[PDB]
Every structure is written in C-alpha cells, then in structure tokens.
C-alpha cells in the first residue's frame, strides 16, 4: 500500500524526466501504474508545468501567427503565461498543451529590437525553430532573456530530438554581460535504446550602444556560439569513435587479431 504522497512524488519524478516528444507515452505509463487518475492529475500538476517550462514547449495561440514558448520567465502565476511579442497573456493547460483566453497586456523597446533580430536568426538557422524574448529587472539590473526551441519528433522512425538555448544579457551600459546555456537531447530506440544529453555554458561581454545595434551584436554572438557548439558536437563524435570508446572496450586486442582460444585454455 504505497501512500498517495509517495505515489505522486514518484510519478512527478518520472514525468519531469520524459524525453522530448514522449510526454504522452510516459504520462500514460504513469497513469496506468498509479491506477488513480484524480490523484495523478491533482498531485502531479506542478510536475506538468515544470516539464513544459524546462522543455521550452512551443505553443500556438489562436489569432496570432508565430508560436510562443512556455518558460519560467513568462510564468505570470495562476496558470497564465506572457506572450511578450504579441503583448498578450493567456491561460495554459499544462497537461493538454492548449492555450486559451488570450487577453491584452521601460524596456519594451530593447526587448522588441532583440526579438526582431532573433526572429530572423531563428528562421535562417533552424528548420522549425521558435523563439521568445523577455525583459526583466533583477536586483535593479535590466536583463534581456532570449529563449530558443527547435525539435523534431519522428516516432515513426523511433527517434526524437530537441534543441534549447537561453541567453541572458545584463544591460549595464556601456557594457553588457552575456550568460547562456545551450542544451541538446536526442532519443533513438529502434530495436534498442540510446540517448544523447548535452549542454554548454557561455560567458561573454558586449559594448552597449543603441538598441538596434546592440540587437545585432547580441544575435551575432548567439550565432557564433551556437554554430561553434554544433560543430564541436559533430567533431567530438569522431573523437569519441576512436579514443574514449576505445577506453571502454577495444575493437581488437593489441595483437590486431581475434583471440586464439586454444592458447587461452592451454
């Protein structure tokens, strides 16, 4: 007799660790294991929201053209998230991934120039990317937070993948400090199972001037770091294919031949 509290806790742990594009399959597994739908839907509510904000889940709102990302920076509380591009707030069901009740809503000019330059960068560099740019003030320091998401779900070919980047620009003119994290997660499971998880931290600085110029300098560093990150990932695969994989098991013994077993036994 597992307590309801421990049931919810373990269910929440599983949901928050679902691979991208596999939330529904993990949820359905957890639902049948729990055998108590009302407990799962009420107890694990925070886990649903945590997953969407951690995953930068893109969401289409009716009446507007490009999607908005569910992030911690847009969390207005009470189940509402901010669309800073279309200047609206909306209700969001974290379980069904559906937005509703679009309702209209100092640094907006700076947030707008960065969003315009990021929107184009994403359309130029990603197959199906989305982005959302925020503007906040932490301990008096004006901060621009840029978030990018791009995923490909192909469960018919037994794989899913997602890219996430988050860029924070702390505006202390004439300098701007850059802190960022880039994240990749891939799951391939045709007659087997493999998962890639990767992240990289970025630290940089920027000279501040006009909003339009700084927006171009902001996106250029984004473009440089993300290009370098993706290229390094591809090149580190080859490094893995013949250095550290070799460290776990060789392709052949040092003799460059397969083992003579009769010699082994005698």
């Amino acid at each position: 007799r597992v307590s309801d509290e421990e049931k919810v806790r373990i269910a929440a742990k599983f949901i928050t660790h679902a691979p991208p594009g596999e939330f529904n399959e993990v949820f359905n597994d957890v639902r049948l294991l729990l055998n108590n739908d009302n407990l799962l839907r009420e107890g694990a509510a925070h886990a649903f929201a945590q997953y969407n904000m951690d995953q930068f889940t893109p969401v289409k709102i009716e009446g507007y053209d490009d999607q908005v990302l569910i992030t911690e920076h847009g969390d207005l509380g009470n189940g509402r998230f901010l669309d800073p591009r279309n200047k609206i707030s909306f209700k969001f069901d974290h379980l069904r991934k559906e937005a509703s009740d679009p309702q209209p809503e100092a640094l907006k000019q700076w947030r707008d120039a960065c969003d315009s330059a990021l929107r184009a960068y994403v359309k130029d560099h990603y197959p199906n990317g989305f982005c959302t740019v925020y503007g906040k003030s932490i301990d008096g320091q004006q901060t621009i937070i840029a978030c990018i998401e791009s995923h490909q779900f192909q469960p018919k070919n037994f794989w899913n993948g997602r890219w996430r980047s988050e860029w924070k620009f702390t505006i202390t003119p004439p300098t701007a400090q850059v802190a960022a994290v880039l994240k990749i997660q891939v799951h391939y499971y045709e007659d087997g199972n493999v998962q890639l998880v990767s992240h990289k931290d970025i630290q940089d600085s920027v000279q501040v001037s006009s909003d339009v110029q700084t927006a171009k300098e902001f996106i250029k560093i984004i473009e440089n770091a993300e290009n370098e990150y993706q290229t390094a990932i591809s090149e580190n695969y080859q490094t893995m294919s013949d250095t550290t994989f070799k460290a776990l098991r060789r392709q052949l013994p040092v003799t460059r031949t397969k083992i003579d077993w009769n010699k082994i036994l005698s």
């Binding site: 660790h17 049948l32 294991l33 993948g161 087997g192 493999v194 990932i233 397969k258």
Partner: protein, 234 residues
C-alpha cells in the same frame, strides 16, 4: 500484464544512466511488479570483494542464494551459508576454467575492468552467465555486458547478450556530452565439442563475436544516428 508492459516501456524511455534509481522508484511505486521487473530488466553490474583471495567479482541473481552471493574464485558465499546452492563438481571445474579464460579475454579487449563467470546445470546440458564491467579511469564512462548462454548437449549453443554503455566528455568546444543506452542481441549455432574445441572455446568465440558486433553496432548504427539527428535539429 498491462502494468508490466507500461513499466517496461517506461524503463525504455527514462534516461539510461539512472536505470538503478528508476528501477528502485518503479518497484517503490508498484511493489507487486518487483519479481517480474527484475526478471525483465538488466541492471548495471555491482562489484563485490572476495576478501579470502583478494579479488573482485560481479554480482547478479545467478550467483545469489538468499541474501548471500557466491564468489567465482573461492566458490564460497558472502555472508557465509551452510548449504548454499553450488554447481556440481564437474561444472565447478568447467566454471574455474571459464573464469580463467574470460579473465584473459577481458584483459585483451578491455585492458582492465572486472569479469565473472557462473555456470549451472540444466535438465539436458548446462547454462551460464558471463559478466564484464569496465569503467573509465579519467573521459569517463562504463561498459556493462551480460551474456547468458545455454549449452544443449556436437552441441547447440544459444547466446543472449545485453551491453549497457554510457560515456561522458567535458570539453571546451562541445561542453558536456553524455551518451547512454543499451543493446540486446541473440545468436545460436551448432559446434563440435572435442579436446581441441572444448565447450569454453565454443562459448568464448560466441561471446567474442557478439561483443565485437554489438560494439560496431553501438558505434555505427546507434551513436551515428544521434549525430545525424543533432545535425538535423539545426
């Protein structure tokens, strides 16, 4: 039943590096699935120390009796058991030869790590498990292989093999990269048994072919697919 299928599907989607925790949380979640889950999910190998001969050995269910585990080196249980399950005198002799043989195999292909071999009798023929664990020194990772072989007595050999393999690098350009997963394969064939081609030579060649093919498959088909996927994400 339905719950077990859900649990096995869950284990296939959750991150493979945390399989022990996910399995423990799963059994904590539904205690009635414990025996079926442990019968259907391979776990990373744990090392124990044979304090009598001063050698490491690997634990699994096949060398367990109650809460005790039998060392392949001393043929003794830790903690000691009065009447713990033991292979026959004949199988024990083949078990010692198999542990010596696969320790050299481990040395030549892995240059380290720990290996263990346990054999047990069947109604007609015998079965056994070959366990190998090799962690990285220091970029880091771990290889865990579990080979379950059945010898039906010219004899018929059936091989079921699982390799669990994770790797992590921490570099300037690519940051932290983690690759983890598993592959399970099967092979069977007939082999002549003789003084020049004994049972262990037949089993060793089968395990050697299996690990080589699994390693090539892990490198080419699976890891190479994730690289292509990453290049398609952006």
């Amino acid at each position: 039943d339905q719950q077990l299928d859900c649990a096995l599907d869950l284990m296939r989607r959750l991150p493979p590096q945390q399989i022990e925790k996910n399995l423990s949380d799963l059994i904590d979640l539904v205690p009635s699935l414990c025996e079926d889950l442990l019968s259907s999910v391979d776990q990373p190998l744990k090392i124990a120390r044979d304090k009598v001969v001063g050698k490491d050995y690997l634990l699994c269910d096949y060398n367990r009796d109650g809460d005790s585990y039998r060392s392949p080196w001393s043929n003794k249980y830790d903690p000691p058991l009065e009447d713990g399950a033991m292979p026959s005198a004949r199988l024990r002799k083949l078990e010692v030869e198999a542990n010596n043989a696969f320790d050299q195999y481990r040395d030549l292909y892995f240059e380290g790590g720990v290996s263990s071999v346990y054999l047990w009798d069947l109604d007609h023929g015998f079965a056994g498990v070959i366990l190998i664990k090799k962690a990285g020194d220091g970029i880091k990772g771990c290889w865990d292989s579990i080979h379950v072989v059945e010898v039906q007595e010219t004899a018929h050999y059936k091989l079921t093999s699982t390799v669990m393999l994770w790797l992590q690098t921490n570099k300037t350009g690519s940051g932290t990269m983690n690759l983890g997963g598993s592959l399970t394969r099967q092979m069977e064939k007939d082999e002549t048994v003789s003084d020049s081609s004994p049972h262990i030579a037949n089993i060793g060649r089968l395990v050697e072919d299996m690990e080589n093919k699994i390693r090539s498959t892990l490198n080419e088909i699976y890891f190479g697919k994730t690289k292509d996927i990453v290049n398609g994400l952006r």
